Amino acid sequence: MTEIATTSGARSVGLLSVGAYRPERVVTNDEICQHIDSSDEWIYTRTGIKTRRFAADDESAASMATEACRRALSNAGLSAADIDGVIVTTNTHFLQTPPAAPMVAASLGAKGILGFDLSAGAAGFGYALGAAADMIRGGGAATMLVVGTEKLSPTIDMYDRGNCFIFADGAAAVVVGETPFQGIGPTVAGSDGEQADAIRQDIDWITFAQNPSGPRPFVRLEGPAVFRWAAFKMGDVGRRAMDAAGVRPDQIDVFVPHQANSRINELLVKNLQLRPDAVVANDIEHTGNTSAASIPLAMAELLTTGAAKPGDLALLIGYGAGLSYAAQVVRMPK
Amino acid sequence: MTEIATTSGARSVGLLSVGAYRPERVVTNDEICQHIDSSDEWIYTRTGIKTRRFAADDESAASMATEACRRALSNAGLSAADIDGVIVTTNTHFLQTPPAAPMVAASLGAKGILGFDLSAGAAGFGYALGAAADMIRGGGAATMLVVGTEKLSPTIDMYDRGNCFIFADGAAAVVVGETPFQGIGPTVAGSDGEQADAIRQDIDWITFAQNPSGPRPFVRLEGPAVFRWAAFKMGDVGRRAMDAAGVRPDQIDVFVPHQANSRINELLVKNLQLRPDAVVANDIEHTGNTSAASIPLAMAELLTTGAAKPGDLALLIGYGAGLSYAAQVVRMPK
Ligand SMILES: [Cl-]
Ligand SMILES: [Cl-]
Ligand SMILES: [Cl-]
Ligand SMILES: [Cl-]
């Protein structure tokens, strides 16, 4: 008889670049406060958000992903031909099928490359990044695109005084490939499925399709439940990720938690025992909560301002719907 | 520069078991023929389908996935405590969020384990299995559940003369873990995003939500286009998968293509130059096309009839929406 072959690729993998796409339209707190009894002062104090970007009607999660990938490729000095696969992570691709990944690949001029869509709420980026790293190390690919993208705005109920000022749109991609030294730490992930209702679409699409003249679905957020969970549990997740990467808290240069709420993230900083001079992502102020796109958007922001430098040691922690979390230590890209 | 650590897992990974859930309700060709001009004879001759199963109204992709996982765990002699992660592959989770994986995990009594949803049409199982193997070999997990699940019945237009008799419901799960010998070969995958319309939801959920007085969304299949692509291209994909696994066509005991159409799979059998006595999955006769669930359901069927034996060398080829494909050689589970 015979034995199935065992193969592998390059074990040392890193981020070669990040590229970001932020839709043109700025929406201020004042504009949001047209339909709720609140204020700019209240929203900012409670969430850290001042403005956010909304995509145009002719844009989609897929279209924004493609643009982010184009920019990541340019920032890496690479072309579509250099990519072996693409993982699209999103929760706002509004078709059951086909998946966005093949269309994104085709738009980039690499229609034939492997790829799929990964959905895990905000934790989607960490899972997709870990999955790309795993695939590359295993020899299934040499270089990959991982893109987080969300068009959340069409799912927002603008009268919902719990979340209409939270969610927003955008996309950001990383090129993942072989590096001289290890650039992506082990994935630390998990969930709490018992709190699946905390971030949800309230009416499923089929129930809706069978009663379309009735209420339509919107995203709902049980804010305090998520706040409590994230603020209390993500510190341990961070410690596990640093432990797995073999780094001490005081070695982290840059902290990039999912941009859910500034107060949650501030509490995490105070729990994580980072250096006083550690750089902390605050992209939320002008980006809001872009779920799956949040972390790569925040990474791009930090590099843009120069607050983060290429090579900086970064701790990434994604947390959100499903109650799903995913974290890893990485070295900052270009 | 601070160095980043790397974990390592098992070298030899395989399918420990499969578990299958087939919904109670049997739907005959004639019962489908009620809103179209066709016959049982025609459907069977053209597609290889005699009956299919429909899930009840109180069932979902997620609920079926859970039951399939329960059975897979039983068939492996394992409990939920033995599982480190779960990947749900589906294209019919009818909520943008939360993802199904955490709720499946919670239902099984392992609310905390890592997991995510992966969408790639019919190729989803191959991608998820590949990702599970990659994660385990990478040391991110030791044992995983990979479950393909589909509730397509509510997306069927009974007046669609091209596909109303094609799609169906069901779920099947595999336990993936360390094995004495190599059980999962290298992943071979790719797509054709230029043919993204071939299998699609015709109207996106948001456009639909904004126009309730218009048509509702249904799944559409450009049958001939998919037939052509699969019949002409999947042979090469199979040969690539066998080559990567270091096995010859004449060493394959079992061929498990996606159950899209019996005549496509018959053509593939001939093209692949397999042994005269090689066994070809034909679960489609009483299952129809269950997209992501199709391959593991077919595997379970072959094991049920005894056509496949545990340990048998099997070629898997998933082909479907997005135009996505994923293939690998595996050893059959229990
Ligand atoms: Cl604290
Ligand atoms: Cl989220
Ligand atoms: Cl069969
Ligand atoms: Cl499909």
CA B211 → CA A209, A216, B208, distances in Å? 11, 11, 5
Mark whether B11 and B152 lie in a shared domain.
Answer: yes
Q: How many residues does chain B have?
A: 334
Mark whether A80 and A139 lie in a shared domain.
Answer: yes
Spatial separation of the C-alpha atoms in residues A62 and A42, rounded to whole Å = 33
The whole-angstrom distance between residue A52's C-alpha and the CA centroid of its chain comes to 16
Mark whether A51 and A82 lie in a shared domain.
Answer: yes
Cβ of A32: how many Cβ atoms within 10 Å? 22
Spatial separation of the C-alpha atoms in residues A162 and A221, rounded to whole Å = 7
**Phi/psi of residue B117, each to 5°?**
-100, 140
Mark whether B1 and B117 lie in a shared domain.
Answer: yes
**Phi/psi of residue B184, each to 5°?**
-130, 120
B4 and A331 in contact (C-beta within 8 Å)?
yes
Q: Mind spelling out the 3-state secondary structure of chain A?
A: CCCCCCCCCCCCEEEEEEEEECCCEEEEHHHHCCCCCCCHHHHHHHHCCCEEEECCCCCCHHHHHHHHHHHHHHHHCCCHHHCCEEEEECCCCCCCCCCHHHHHHHHHCCCCCEEEEEEECECHHHHHHHHHHHHHHHCCCCCEEEEEEEECHHHCCCCCCCCCCCECEEEEEEEEEECCCCCECCCEEEECHHHHHHEEECCCHHHHHCCCCCCCCCEEECHHHHHHHHHHHHHHHHHHHHHHHCCCHHHCCEEEECCCCHHHHHHHHHHHCCCCCCEECCCHHHHCECHHHHHHHHHHHHHHHCCCCCCCEEEEEEEECCCEEEEEEEECCC
* DSSP strand pairing (B85-89 vs A199-201): unpaired
Q: Evaluate the omega torsion of the peptide bond into residue B333 and state whether it is cis, within 30 degrees of 0.
A: no
- Out of A182, A208, A224, pick the residue that ends a domain: A182
Resolution, rounded to a tenth of an Å?
Answer: 1.9
A258: CA distance to ligand 2 center in Å? 9
A306 and A29 in contact (C-beta within 8 Å)?
no
Residue A57 CB burial class (10 angstroms; 0-12, 13-18, ≥19): exposed
Measured distance between the N- and C-terminal CA atoms of chain A, rounded to whole angstroms? 49
Per-residue DSSP letters for B210-267? Answer: H-TTSPPP-EEE-HHHHHHHHHHHHHHHHHHHHHHHT--GGG--EEEE-SS-HHHHHH
Mark whether A58 and A169 lie in a shared domain.
Answer: yes
B261 and B48 in contact (C-beta within 8 Å)?
yes
Mark whether B59 and B148 lie in a shared domain.
Answer: yes
With contacts defined as CB-CB under 8 Å, which chain A residues touch B200?
95, 97-98
Question: Which method resolved this structure?
Answer: X-ray
A128: CA distance to ligand 1 center in Å? 29
Spatial separation of the C-alpha atoms in residues A217 and B205, rounded to whole Å = 10
Spatial separation of the C-alpha atoms in residues A163 and A222, rounded to whole Å = 9
Mark whether B151 and B212 lie in a shared domain.
Answer: no
Domain count, chain A: 2
**Phi/psi of residue A193, each to 5°?**
-65, -20
Tokens read off for B284: 């489609």
- Burial A69-86, CB ≥16 within 10 A → b, else e: bbbbbebbebebebbbbb
Mark whether A131 and A17 lie in a shared domain.
Answer: yes
B284 and B47 in contact (C-beta within 8 Å)?
yes
Helix (H, G, I), strand (E, B) or coil at B189: strand
Spatial separation of the C-alpha atoms in residues B317 and B225, rounded to whole Å = 18
Q: Which residue carries 């053209």 as its tokens?
A: B46
Measured distance between the N- and C-terminal CA atoms of chain B, rounded to whole angstroms? 48
**CATH number of the domain encompassing residue B228:** 3.40.47.10
Can you give the residue range of the structural domain that contains A48?
A: 1-182
Mark whether B31 and B53 lie in a shared domain.
Answer: yes
Q: How many residues does chain A have?
A: 334
Angle of helix A223-245 relative to helix A262-272, nearest 10 degrees, comes to 40
Task: Please give the helix or strand (H or E) that residue B270 lies within, else none.
Answer: helix B262-271
Return left, alpha or beta for A131; rule: phi > 0 is left, psi -120 to 50 is alpha, else beta.
alpha
- B91 with A94: Cβ contact below 8 A: no
With contacts defined as CB-CB under 8 Å, which chain A residues touch B324?
98-99, 101-102, 115-116
- A116 with B324: Cβ contact below 8 A: yes
Spatial separation of the C-alpha atoms in residues A228 and A220, rounded to whole Å = 17
How many A/B residue pairs have CB atoms within 8 Å?
315
Q: Which residue carries 């068009």 as its tokens?
A: A151
A3: CA distance to ligand 4 center in Å? 31
- Out of A135, A158, A182, pick the residue that ends a domain: A182
A273: CA distance to ligand 1 center in Å? 9
Cβ of A213: how many Cβ atoms within 10 Å? 7
Q: Of the ligands numbered here, which is closest to the C-alpha atom of A98?
A: 4
Spatial separation of the C-alpha atoms in residues B327 and B318, rounded to whole Å = 6
Mark whether B178 and B189 lie in a shared domain.
Answer: no
Mark whether A40 and A68 lie in a shared domain.
Answer: yes
Return left, alpha or beta for A104; rule: phi > 0 is left, psi -120 to 50 is alpha, else beta.
alpha
Query: SS3 breakdown of chain B: % helix, strand, coil, rounded to 5?
Result: 35, 25, 40
B45 and B38 in contact (C-beta within 8 Å)?
no
Sign of CA dihedral A106, B88, B149, B129: positive
Mark whether A16 and A64 lie in a shared domain.
Answer: yes
Instruction: Name which of A276, A265, A288, A221 is nearest A29 in CA terms.
Output: A288
Q: Mind spelling out the 3-state secondary structure of B52-117?
A: EEECCCCCCHHHHHHHHHHHHHHHHCCCHHHCCEEEEECCCCCCCCCCHHHHHHHHCCCCCCEEEE
Q: Which residue carries 């969970």 as its tokens?
A: A229
| Separation in Å, CA of A312 to nearest CA in chain B | 8
With contacts defined as CB-CB under 8 Å, which chain B residues touch A201?
95-97
Spatial separation of the C-alpha atoms in residues A49 and A259, rounded to whole Å = 10
Torsion of CA B68, B72, B75, B79, to 10 degrees: -110
Q: Of the ligands numbered here, which is closest to the C-alpha atom of A266?
A: 1
- Out of B182, B216, B232, pick the residue that ends a domain: B182
